[PDB]
Amino acid sequence: EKFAFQAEVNRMMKLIINSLYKNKEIFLRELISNASDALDKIRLISLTDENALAGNEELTVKIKCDKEKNLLHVTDTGVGMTREELVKNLGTIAGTSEFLNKMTESTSELIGQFGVGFYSAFLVADKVIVTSKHNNDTQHIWESDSNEFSVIADPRGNTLGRGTTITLVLKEEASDYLELDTIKNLVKKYSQFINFPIYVWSSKTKTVWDWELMN
């Protein structure tokens, strides 16, 4: 169940971390971008497969703060990941050498172009948890504090239907990203041109809670 990161992923985590410590908010842009690609992937698959969306029929991103547990959740109903793709897509790296040299020698935009911005989550988080349900597997949980990771079968079963939740246990100094209005604010900036509905779990007025559409 325990796994080691590949060597180049450890360097990438260090490069990403020590060049973007001044622009930490970019992690939420990269999580929204990753959510959108996964929605695109399942939508393409649904073009040729009648039952692609049966595990869950919406195509959304849902964002939820838990200030009392110190947690931020980003959930998409895209393609999701099998247990094997959790191990490989998150712990390894399939021209990577060229591109860790391109970053050592703005770095903000070209981590977007290689699709490795997932790792920016460690700028604001002490632990990262990925819960994922793919059509060809059971729900699994991937968990890491960057020093190792483990993949386990989710004992709660298939609660996602299909897709992925990223959970971040944020560092103490990142508690500003628990505040409901900063989250809504950053979600606007980084979702203006995403082609899927993106919601924040918010408050309105008696205080009531519901999904508030963002894009």
Residues 6+ apart with CB under 8 A from 208: none
Residues 6+ apart with CB under 8 A from 92: 6, 9
CA distance 157 to 151: 14
120, 111 contact by CB (below 8 A): yes
Annotated binding site for ATP: 34, 76, 89, 118
DSSP for 17-41 reads HHHSTT-TTHHHHHHHHHHHHHHHH
CA distance 112 to 1: 30
The experimental method is X-ray
Q: Which amino acid is at 102?
A: K
Q: Which amino acid is at 206?
A: K
Residues 6+ apart with CB under 8 A from 84: 137
Annotated binding site: 34, 76, 89, 118
91, 2 contact by CB (below 8 A): no
- Please report which helix (H) or strand (E) contains residue 191, including its range: helix 180-191
- Quoted resolution (Å): 2.7
- Residue 197 structure tokens: 């509905």
- Residue 92 structure tokens: 């390894």
Give all domains of the chain, ordered by start, each with its CATH number. Answer: 1-215 (3.30.565.10)
Residues 6+ apart with CB under 8 A from 13: 5, 119, 122, 146
Task: List C-alpha distances in Å: 64 to 17, 118, 159.
Answer: 24, 18, 16
Q: Which amino acid is at 22?
A: K
* Distance, C-alpha 48 to centroid of its chain: 26
Among the listed residues 168, 187, 188, 181, the one whose alpha carbon sits nearest the alpha carbon of residue 125 = 168
C-alpha dihedral (144, 150, 152, 158), degrees to nearest 10 = 30
Q: Please tell me the number of Cα atoms within 13 Å of 195 on its side-chain side.
A: 6
Q: Which amino acid is at 162?
A: R
CA distance 194 to 204: 25
Task: List C-alpha distances in Å: 113 to 9, 23, 30, 107.
Answer: 16, 17, 11, 10
